[PDB]
Amino acid sequence: SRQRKLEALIRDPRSPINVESLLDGLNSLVLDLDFPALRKNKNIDNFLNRYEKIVKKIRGLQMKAEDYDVVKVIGRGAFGEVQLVRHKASQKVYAMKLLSKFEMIKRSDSAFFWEERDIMAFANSPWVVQLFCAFQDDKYLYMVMEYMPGGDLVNLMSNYDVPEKWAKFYTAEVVLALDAIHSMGLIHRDVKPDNMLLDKHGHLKLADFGTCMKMDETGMVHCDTAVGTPDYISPEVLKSQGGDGYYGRECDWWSVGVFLFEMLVGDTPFYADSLVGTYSKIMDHKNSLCFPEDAEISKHAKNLICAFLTDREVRLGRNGVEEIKQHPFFKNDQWNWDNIRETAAPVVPELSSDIDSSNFDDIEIPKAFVGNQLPFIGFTYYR
Amino acid sequence: SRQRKLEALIRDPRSPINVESLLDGLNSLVLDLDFPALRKNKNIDNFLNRYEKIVKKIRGLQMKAEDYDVVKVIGRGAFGEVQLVRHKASQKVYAMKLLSKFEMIKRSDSAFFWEERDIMAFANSPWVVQLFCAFQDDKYLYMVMEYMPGGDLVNLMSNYDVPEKWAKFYTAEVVLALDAIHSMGLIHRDVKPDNMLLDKHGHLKLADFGTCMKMDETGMVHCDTAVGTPDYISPEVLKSQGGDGYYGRECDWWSVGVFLFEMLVGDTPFYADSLVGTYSKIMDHKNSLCFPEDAEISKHAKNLICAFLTDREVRLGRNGVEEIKQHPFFKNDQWNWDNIRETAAPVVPELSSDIDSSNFDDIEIPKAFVGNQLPFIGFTYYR
Ligand SMILES: C[C@@H](N)[C@H]1CC[C@H](C(=O)Nc2ccncc2)CC1
Ligand SMILES: C[C@@H](N)[C@H]1CC[C@H](C(=O)Nc2ccncc2)CC1
C-alpha cells in the first residue's frame, strides 16, 4: 500500500525523514522560535504554547548528555572535545565527541559533520571508528563512538623508533582504510597521524571525516578551498585554493607518502617555520624533498615515498590501489593484504581497566526568524 | 524503557506529537519558508534544498483530495463546502468537508476546528457524525465523514407538518446527543436544525462542533464573544458579547426550546426583520414569547417550551438532564430514554443508491517569516 511505503521511510535510519529527523525538526523549530521577540507574531505564539508541555517530556525521554559520566577529557582543541565516558545505564565505556554548534556552521563552511556521521554510522568497516549514537542539544552535537584505547599515530611515532617492519604495517593498514573510504565513493582529504587511532589490540582505524567528499562519476571532485593540515596537503589541494580545483583520490596517497616519511625519518618532509615556507616547499617538492643522511631507510622505502610525493599526473595510485599494494616495500612475512588486521599488531596496548587512558595526554537572541538549528536537523541518530 | 515510552506517544493518535503532527510539522515548515524572499537567509535555503526531494515523494504518498471523486456538492456556504465523495480505491461513499485555511484563522477567531476534529474523531458516539480521516493541503482542510443521507432538520421541518408524536422523538434525540457532548466536558453553543443531520435510517446525529468549549471544573465557561445563529442564541451568550460572560450548559437547552417551538409552530419564536429586533426579542423573552392561536400544541408542549425559554437561573436542565427527561411532554409509547435510537424513526429515508442525494438541494507571498501553517499542524488524522 501507499501507507506501508510511508512507514518504510519513517523507520529507515538512512532516510532523511526517519523519526529522528522529524523530532529534530519539531525540536529545532521550537528553539528557533521561542523568543519574546517573535512570539509577538500571532501564529508563532499560539503554536509554541501548544507544544510547550509535550516537548519538555520528550526532551527528557531522549538521549541526553546526562545519560553519561565523564571519565576525563582525552582530546580537546580547535574542534570541540573528546571525552572518555561511561554510559550510566549500560555501565559501558565510550568515547564521546562534543561539537560546538556555534562554530560548526558559522565559522566552518567546510567541516561536514553530515559526511562524518554517515561514515561512522554506516561504514560498518573494521577500518572506521564506529558511531553508536548521535544527539544534539541547543549548544552541541554529541557523538558516541568506540573508545580507541591505543591513542593516535602521532602519539605512537612520538614514543618509538619505528623500524620499517613496523612502518610497513601501519602504512598498509592506512592504505586499506583509505581504499575502504574511496570505494565508498569518497575522498578523505585529511590523512594525518592525528586522524589515525589504534583500538584495544593496537590496530588502526580512521577517526575523523569532516573533510570527505563524494566523487564524480569520473572519480574526481571540483573544489575551491584547501583543506587539511599544512604539513600534509597535496599540491593540487593547495592550488585548489585559487579557484578551479579539480582532483581525484590520489591526493590521499600524497598524504600517505608524507606520513611514511614522517614515520621513517621522524620529521615531516616539508617542515618550515612559516606555513608558506611549508607550502613553498610542497609546491617545490621536486627540489624540496630529500632524506637526511643519518636517516636509516631502505631504498624501497625511499622509492615508495618518492612515488607518492609527486604530481598527480605521475603519482602512484592514479591507477588504483593495486600498484601501491604491489610495491616491493610491502613484501614481508607477517601478513598479506587480506589477513593483516588479524595478524599481530607491532605495538600492543596493555590496558589495566576499561578506563585506562594511558595512551592519551592530560588535557588543559535573534530579531528576524534566523533559523540556526536547521542545518542540525536529522543529525540525532539512534542504535 | 525510556525508548518505548517515546514510541508510545508517536503512535498514540490522541498524542499532539503522533506521526501526523510531525509530518504536518515538517510539511508546513516547508511551505512557510519556501519563498525567494527568505531563501536569501543562509539556513533557510540549505534546509529547503535538502528535504526538497523527499517531501515531494511524501506529498504524493499521503492522503490527497485526488484519492476521492466528487459526486456533487451538497452543502456550500459561509464555511466552505460539503461534497458527496467516492473513495476511489475502496469504492466507498463519504461526505467530505472543505475548509478554507485562509478564512479559518485570519477571519475566524472562534471556529475551533480542533474541538470539532477531536469530537468527530474520538467521540465514538451514535450521536455524533464520525470522522474517518482528515487531511490538509496548502489551501484546505478536508474532513472525511459519514454521509448522512437523511438531510438536516431544517430540510425535514421544511417538508412536513411535524406532529407532536414526531417532535417528541427529535427533541429526545437532540437531548441525548447534547448530554453526550456535555458529559464529555463540552458545551455545544450552536444547537440549530442545520447542525442536526439524519442517517440512513432517519435517526439524528450532531454534525457541527466548531463552537464547543471545555467547561470549568464547575461546569461553567468564561466568554466574551457571542456565537451561534441569531435566531437561537441564549440571552446569556448574547450578553457575553459585552465582556464578562459566564455561563453553563443550560444555554444549549435554551436553543432546544427554540428548536421545539420552531418545529411545532413552523416559525422561530423570536423572528424579526433586523437581527437586533431578534436580539431585542430574545432579551425581552418574558414578554416577547408566545403562541399563535391557530398553532395546535399541547399544554405540555407549551410548558416545556416555556420551561426552556427563560433565564438560566430558572431554566429547565440547570439541575441536569434528568428533569428534562422527566417532563410529561415526553411520555409516549414508542420508546423510552434507553432504546430510542433502536426504535422506528418517524421519517424513513428511501435511498435508491449509495449516492442518492435527494434530501439535499442542488447548490450554486510574505516578507517576514509569517508562519501561517502553524495552527494547522497536527490536524491531519488517519484511521
Ligand atoms: C584531529 C581531529 N581531526 C580529531 C581526530 C580524531 C579525534 C577523535 O575522534 N579521538 C578519539 C576517538 C575515539 N577514541 C579515542 C580518541 C578527535 C580530534
Ligand atoms: C451549518 C453548518 N454549521 C454546517 C452544518 C453541518 C453540515 C455538514 O457537515 N453536512 C453533512 C455531513 C454529512 N452528510 C451530509 C451533510 C455543513 C455545514
Swiss-Prot record, chains A, B:
Residue stretches making up the Protein kinase domain: 68-330
Positions bearing Phosphothreonine: 380
Active site: 190 (proton acceptor)
Region annotated Interaction with NPM1, chain positions: 349-383
Domain AGC-kinase C-terminal: residue ranges: 333-383
Compartment(s) of residence: Cytoplasm; Cell membrane; Nucleus; Cytoplasm, Cytoskeleton, Microtubule organizing center, Centrosome
Tissues showing expression: Highly expressed in whole brain and in cerebellum, and at lower levels in heart and lung. Detected at low levels in skeletal muscle, spleen, liver, kidney and pancreas.
Post-translational modification as stated in the protein's UniProt record: Autophosphorylated. Dephosphorylation by PTPN11 stimulates its RHOA binding activity.
Binding site for ATP: 74-82, 97
Function as written in the Swiss-Prot or TrEMBL entry: Protein kinase which is a key regulator of actin cytoskeleton and cell polarity. Involved in regulation of smooth muscle contraction, actin cytoskeleton organization, stress fiber and focal adhesion formation, neurite retraction, cell adhesion and motility via phosphorylation of ADD1, BRCA2, CNN1, EZR, DPYSL2, EP300, MSN, MYL9/MLC2, NPM1, RDX, PPP1R12A and VIM. Phosphorylates SORL1 and IRF4. Acts as a negative regulator of VEGF-induced angiogenic endothelial cell activation. Positively regulates the activation of p42/MAPK1-p44/MAPK3 and of p90RSK/RPS6KA1 during myogenic differentiation.
UniProt domain comment: An interaction between Thr-380 and Asp-24 is essential for kinase activity and dimerization.
Assembly with partners or alone: Homodimer. Interacts with IRS1. Interacts with RAF1. Interacts with RHOA (activated by GTP). Interacts with RHOB and RHOC. Interacts with PPP1R12A. Interacts with EP300. Interacts with CHORDC1. Interacts with BRCA2. Interacts with NPM1; this interaction enhances ROCK2 activity. Interacts with SORL1. Interacts with PJVK.
Family indicated by similarity: Belongs to the protein kinase superfamily. AGC Ser/Thr protein kinase family.
Name of the protein: Rho-associated protein kinase 2
Species annotation: Bos taurus (Bovine)
Gene transcribed to yield this protein: ROCK2
Boundaries of the shown chain within the full protein: 25 to 417 of 1388
